[PDB]
Write an enzyme that holds these catalytic residues in place. Structure first.
Site, PDB file in Angstrom:
ATOM      1  N   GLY A 116     -29.320  32.672 -50.309  1.00 36.83           N
ATOM      2  CA  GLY A 116     -28.068  32.457 -51.042  1.00 36.83           C
ATOM      3  C   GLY A 116     -28.536  31.174 -52.359  1.00 36.83           C
ATOM      4  N   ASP A 125     -39.841  26.584 -39.941  1.00 34.09           N
ATOM      5  CA  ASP A 125     -39.957  26.668 -41.075  1.00 34.09           C
ATOM      6  C   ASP A 125     -40.597  25.334 -42.256  1.00 34.09           C
ATOM      7  OD1 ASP A 125     -40.630  28.499 -43.341  1.00 34.09           O
ATOM      8  OD2 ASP A 125     -38.407  28.680 -44.088  1.00 34.09           O
ATOM      9  N   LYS A 182     -31.674  28.770 -55.808  1.00 30.53           N
ATOM     10  CA  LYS A 182     -31.406  30.258 -55.603  1.00 30.53           C
ATOM     11  C   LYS A 182     -32.449  30.891 -54.761  1.00 30.53           C
TER      12      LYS A 182
END
Ligand SMILES: COc1cc(-c2cncc(-c3ccc(C4CCN(C)CC4)cc3)c2C)cc(OC)c1OC
Ligand SMILES: COc1cc(-c2cncc(-c3ccc(C4CCN(C)CC4)cc3)c2C)cc(OC)c1OC
Ligand SMILES: COc1cc(-c2cncc(-c3ccc(C4CCN(C)CC4)cc3)c2C)cc(OC)c1OC
EC number: 2.7.11.30
Length: 287
Positions: free
Chosen positions: A19, A133, A15
């Site tokens: 989302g 990322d 989580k």
């Protein structure tokens, strides 16, 4: 014909602001289901747009299964469905596990392999892709000891999203805003910086002469948790700090070679950094 689309969501395995990720079941087979928050819809769109352009298939890239958009009463539901890796993320794995030379090299060469596959343009093929990322939470561990790279929600494509990268892993040119944004090679060099940090995270967990370092994230000793952009810029750009190489690495030939490699991912001058293909070759010649 019947088109079976039901996925049984069995347990939440992640989580965040993005989302949630769920372990699910389709036709008796585990799948991973990323359910996007409204706040991060553009990450679903970018990963979907990339896979609609090129169906990446590589042992060190998380395996795509599906992108699903479903109309709800008042909203749109966005799911990304991928293969499921029950061992979880590299970040998860390193907390609890130490490594020997063979397992450490296998992990880092598998990451370099996935990254070089993203970076390379193939004619006929695939566009060149930068991740933007890369970090240990965006790498999954497979049962065979190799890893795979995940999360192409910030990826950029080249042929000859208000989300930004994770600040802790940002290269100096991102933090000081000198990055040459119209130049695709810039983005590859930002990934290489982040790869060097991941290499440092993994190497710490490799045992030599009965010694290992505890798991720490990059810059744990010089920035707070959830460091600010400014926190990072002062460390990386102003003071030009780099992660510590412990003395004990210099008793071990593998960690000595890995320290040299991670140094050559961290040059202030982005064009001085190694390429993913050169990192692979160096890793194949260690041990
Ligand atoms: C729509 O949505 C989902 C669908 C499925 C799914 C389930 N059964 C069968 C299929 C299938 C694949 C391929 C063909 C081809 C056969 C060759 N022919 C020449 C062209 C067509 C037909 C059918 C799919 C794609 C799974 C899903 O989730 C795992 C879906 O939801 C995301
Ligand atoms: C989305 O994901 C999964 C999908 C399926 C699946 C279900 N029905 C049909 C298919 C299919 C059949 C045949 C072709 C054709 C293509 C062109 N030419 C005529 C030769 C072959 C393509 C596709 C598939 C691939 C199974 C999966 O797992 C076992 C999937 O993975 C979760
Ligand atoms: C990074 O990004 C994505 C990752 C995945 C993904 C795929 N396999 C396995 C996982 C996983 C399973 C289990 C745990 C454990 C960790 C320890 N403890 C906390 C209990 C749970 C962690 C991780 C995930 C998260 C799917 C994605 O999309 C569907 C991702 O986004 C692209």
């Amino acid at each position: 014909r019947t088109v079976a689309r039901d996925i049984t969501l069995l347990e939440c395995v992640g989580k965040g602001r993005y989302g949630e990720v769920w372990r699910g079941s389709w036709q008796g087979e585990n799948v991973a289901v990323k359910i996007f928050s409204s706040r991060d819809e553009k990450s679903w769109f970018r990963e979907t747009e990339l896979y609609n352009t090129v169906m990446l298939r590589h042992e060190n890239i998380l395996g795509f299964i599906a992108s699903d958009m479903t109309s709800r009463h008042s909203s749109t539901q966005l799911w990304l469905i991928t293969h499921y890796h029950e061992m979880g993320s590299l970040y998860d794995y390193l907390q609890l596990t130490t490594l020997d030379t063979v397992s450490c090299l296998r992990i880092v060469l598998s990451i370099a392999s996935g990254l070089a596959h993203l970076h390379i343009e193939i004619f006929g093929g695939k566009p060149a892709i930068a991740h933007r990322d890369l970090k240990s939470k965006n790498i999954l561990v497979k049962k065979n000891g190799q890893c795979c790279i995940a999360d192409l929600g910030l990826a950029v494509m080249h042929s000859q999203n208000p989300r930004v990268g994770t600040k802790r892993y940002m290269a100096p040119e991102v933090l000081d805003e000198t990055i040459q944004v119209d130049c695709f090679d810039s983005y590859k060099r930002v990934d290489i910086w982040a790869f060097g940090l991941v290499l440092w995270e993994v190497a710490r967990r490799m045992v030599s002469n009965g010694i290992v370092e505890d798991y720490k994230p990059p810059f744990y000793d010089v920035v707070p948790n959830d460091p600010s952009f400014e926190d990072m810029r002062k460390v990386v750009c102003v003071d030009q700090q780099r992660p510590n190489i412990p003395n004990r690495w210099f008793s071990d030939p593998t960690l000595t070679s890995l320290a040299k490699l991670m140094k050559e991912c961290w040059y202030q001058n982005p064009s001085a950094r190694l390429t993913a293909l050169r990192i692979k070759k160096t890793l194949t010649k260690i041990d």
